[PDB]
Amino acid sequence: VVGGTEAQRNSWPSQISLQYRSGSSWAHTCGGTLIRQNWVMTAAHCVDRELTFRVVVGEHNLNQNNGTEQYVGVQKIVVHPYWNTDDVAAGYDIALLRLAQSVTLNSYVQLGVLPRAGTILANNSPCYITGWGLTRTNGQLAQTLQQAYLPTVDYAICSSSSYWGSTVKNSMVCAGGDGVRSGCQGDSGGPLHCLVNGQYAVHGVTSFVSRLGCNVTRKPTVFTRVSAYISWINNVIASN
Ligand SMILES: C=CCC[C@@H](O)CO
Ligand SMILES: C=CCC[C@H](O)CO
Ligand SMILES: [Ca+2]
């Protein structure tokens, strides 16, 4: 997250860190959202490669022991059937991971709330992006969980020539674009928490940003719209 501030360690309990084994050590690669004690929602492009993955819940500081972490392996990866690695702009950047074990819920580990199917947020709705991703374009990962205010930018506008144009679809949500705050490499798969009816629900899964840079004016961060996949999500967790 570029232009963010450290989050209180118990503000976003559904946030998880997706990591892969590099030889003998583990490295953070993406974010994700705990939606079931044994299910995690993330971006399909985060699990495109065939590597060994593990999920960490109740995490705050990646390099320090917080005394609240839970490490669990991933036994099943269900990528959306229409996902195409070479065409992220086509959408469908979403995947579901069945964890090898059910995590224990507590003050630092909670389930994220999903929106009602087909829900569209009004332009400029209040949302927050969270993650341990790059704090600067071509920079380095954040040690502590970062958060940033990132209001939505509706489709009509986001798909206009002055913004993303035809690269953005109605199955995506755009947020930010003030040239100061944004998601960045390492935040992918993470949540876009939006305040609706006095409650924060996960309306997006971080998908991509501009090739020019992370924080670019008129180039908001693009997210997979969760409300457009509610049926698919339930169908998967119902038969797996
Ligand atoms: C926050 C998303 C970064 C994803 C990049 O790979 C796209 O340029
Ligand atoms: C296992 C801890 C996460 C490591 C990070 O990717 C950077 O050191
Ligand atoms: Ca830690």
- What CATH number does the domain containing 179 carry? 2.40.10.10
Task: Judge if 116 and 223 occupy the same domain.
Answer: yes
Task: Judge if 119 and 208 occupy the same domain.
Answer: yes
Which residue's CA is minimally distant from atom 4 of ligand 2? Answer: 27
Contact criterion met (CB below 8 Å) for 190 and 32: yes
CA 173 to ligand 1 centroid distance, Å: 15
The catalytic position among 14, 159, 182, 188 is 188
Q: In the numeric block, which tokens belong to residue 10? A: 């118990």
Domain count, the chain: 2
Nearest in space to 112 (alpha carbons), one of 93, 91, 130: 130
CA trace torsion 134, 31, 195, 91 (10° rounding): 100
- What phi and psi, each to the nearest 5 degrees, are found at residue 20? -125, 155
- Residue 111 burial class via C-beta count within 10 angstroms: exposed 0-12, middle 13-18, buried 19 and up: middle
Ligand 2, residues at Cβ distance < 6 Å? 26-28, 62-63, 141
CA trace torsion 47, 53, 54, 59 (10° rounding): -60
- Structural domain of 151: 1-12+112-227
Contact criterion met (CB below 8 Å) for 59 and 16: yes
Task: Judge if 41 and 117 occupy the same domain.
Answer: no
* Cα–Cα distance for residue pair 76/128, rounded to 1 Å: 29
Q: How many CB atoms lie within 10 A of CB 232?
A: 16
Nearest in space to 151 (alpha carbons), one of 187, 171, 180, 131: 180
Q: In the numeric block, which tokens belong to residue 114? A: 């999903």
- What phi and psi, each to the nearest 5 degrees, are found at residue 183? -85, 165
Q: Resolution of the coordinates in A?
A: 2.2
Task: Judge if 122 and 21 occupy the same domain.
Answer: no
How determined?
A: X-ray
Task: Judge if 202 and 137 occupy the same domain.
Answer: yes
The 172-175 sheet, strands edge to edge: 5-6, 146-149, 127-131, 191-196, 199-208, 221-225, 172-175, 152-153
* Cα–Cα distance for residue pair 48/79, rounded to 1 Å: 8
Specify the DSSP class assigned to residue 215.
S
